[PDB]
Amino acid sequence: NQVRPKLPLLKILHAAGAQGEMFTVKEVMHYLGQYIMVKQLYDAAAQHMVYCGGDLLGELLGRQSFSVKDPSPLYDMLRKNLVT
């Protein structure tokens, strides 16, 4: 199946390599993990901790830090920003 990012979440995907308008959940996550690596938001020391606070992704998450080993705040955000 396929879903549509919102204008706040789509800007974040088109700044990683994505091109178009509509994607799959699974490739949303690919281009979403690309973002954290290109703009350098992850912790170099403990590479499970992302520091999205300063930038758009954080304002979208309602957080300023989150771990990749507990990513449920991604699935609070992945339901609120994708039209099924």
Binding site: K26, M29, H30, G33, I36, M37, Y42, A46, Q47, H48, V68, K69, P71, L74
Partner: peptide, 11 residues
């Protein structure tokens, strides 16, 4: 460690 495989448990 490595964000690469940490970000592959979710996906």
């Amino acid at each position: 460690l490595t964000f690469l495989e940490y970000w592959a448990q979710l996906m």
